[PDB]
Amino acid sequence: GAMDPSSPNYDKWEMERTDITMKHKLGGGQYGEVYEGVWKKYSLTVAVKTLKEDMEVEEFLKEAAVMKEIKHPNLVQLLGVCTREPPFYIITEFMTYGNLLDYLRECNRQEVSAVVLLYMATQISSAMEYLEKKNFIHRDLAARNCLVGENHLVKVADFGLSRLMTGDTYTAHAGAKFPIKWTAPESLAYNKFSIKSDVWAFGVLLWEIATYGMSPYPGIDLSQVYELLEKDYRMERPEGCPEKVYELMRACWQWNPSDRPSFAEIHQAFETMFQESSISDEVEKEL
Ligand SMILES: Cc1ccc(NC(=O)c2ccc(CN3CCN(C)CC3)cc2)cc1Nc1nccc(-c2cccnc2)n1
Ligand SMILES: O=C(Nc1ccc(OC(F)(F)F)cc1)c1cnc(N2CC[C@@H](O)C2)c(-c2cncnc2)c1
Ligand SMILES: [Cl-]
């Protein structure tokens, strides 16, 4: 019996399907085959990713394998899998306040002050410093791919949104759907993805936080983004953004990937930046 520790077929991550009470599809279908679920014995709400009827079985099992290798307070936590027989499940913890992009756009601003936005950026930088140390690449870092929990807890996730999301967030490029405005120039021009191209996307994500979720490069056509960046254009400093924070965005957006800071340096910069000074005072001064 594969479920017993004695079994040489035992996998600690394999869970009993009957332990999960499957409820409705999450967020009106914005996540594809992801369902709200209840883990019986723990009376815990969970998020359950499944596969839609009938080659993507290998991508799904690869995601399950990657998730078993990663553990960080700011990375969505794997709780278990149902991969012995179809339908295949990936179970994670449910995050009360849902995705960060909608959260930023809908939040009460007296609550989600400059101090809270700084904490959210710092948490994301810690999750990314861990992925950098473990030699992983995210590939689609953005606010739409982060979740918000209790007490402004932020977790980085990866919802595989490219072929699910409606609108112009992701558009056709190199035979796939790219989020052009978050994509490092070497990723668009030379198909080069690395931790440094995640650094570039982090700079865009920082700008989303700094604007309460505004869409980047507003009013600029997607056909013009590469050319503008290649000619040294960069998004202007958001209104009220502290200069030290914008300096960090600009460092993320160096044309040469090798010139961008590592996530360890970005994380260290957030800790040091306001160790003595108040971000609240810097924002008030800027405004
Ligand atoms: C149910 C599930 C299944 C799998 C995943 N997976 C991930 O979030 C993830 C995170 C990091 C990696 C690391 N990886 C490194 C390699 N590169 C190329 C890709 C990323 C992989 C998968 C999340 C979830 N969780 C999830 N999914 C969709 C929506 C929600 C959700 C929505 C609202 C409230 N609470 C939770 N929660
Ligand atoms: O706090 C703010 N900015 C901030 C930036 C970085 C930062 O560091 C972190 F690391 F990124 F988190 C922390 C805070 C802030 C305050 N007031 C705003 N106001 C817009 C005009 C009035 O309404 C006040 C805006 C604004 C709103 N919409 C679009 N752009 C900017 C933003
Ligand atoms: Cl990887």
Swiss-Prot record:
A motif (Kinase activation loop) lies at residues 158-182. Disruption phenotype: Mutants are born with the expected Mendelian frequency, but fail to thrive and most die within three weeks after birth. Most mutants are runted, and have atrophied thymuses with severe thymocyte deficiency. Mutants that survive to weaning age are most often runted, and about half of them show lymphopenia. They display a major reduction in the number of pre-B and immature B-cell classes in bone marrow with a wide variation between individuals, but essentially normal mature B-cell levels. Mutants are highly susceptible to infections. Non-receptor tyrosine-protein kinase that plays a role in many key processes linked to cell growth and survival such as cytoskeleton remodeling in response to extracellular stimuli, cell motility and adhesion, receptor endocytosis, autophagy, DNA damage response and apoptosis. Coordinates actin remodeling through tyrosine phosphorylation of proteins controlling cytoskeleton dynamics like WASF3 (involved in branch formation); ANXA1 (involved in membrane anchoring); DBN1, DBNL, CTTN, RAPH1 and ENAH (involved in signaling); or MAPT and PXN (microtubule-binding proteins). It comes from Mus musculus (Mouse). Residues 20-270 form the Protein kinase domain. DNA damage-induced activation of ABL1 requires the function of ATM and Ser-223 phosphorylation. Polyubiquitinated. Polyubiquitination of ABL1 leads to degradation. Interacts with INPPL1/SHIP2. Interacts with SORBS1 following insulin stimulation. Found in a trimolecular complex containing CDK5 and CABLES1. Interacts with CABLES1 and PSTPIP1. Interacts with ZDHHC16. Interacts (via SH3 domain) with CASP9; the interaction is direct and increases in the response of cells to genotoxic stress and ABL1/c-Abl activation. It is found in: Cytoplasm, Cytoskeleton; Nucleus; Mitochondrion. Widely expressed. This is Tyrosine-protein kinase ABL1. The modification Phosphoserine is found at S7, S223. Changing P242S: Loss of inhibition by GNF-2. The modification Phosphotyrosine is found at Y31, Y35, Y170, Y190.
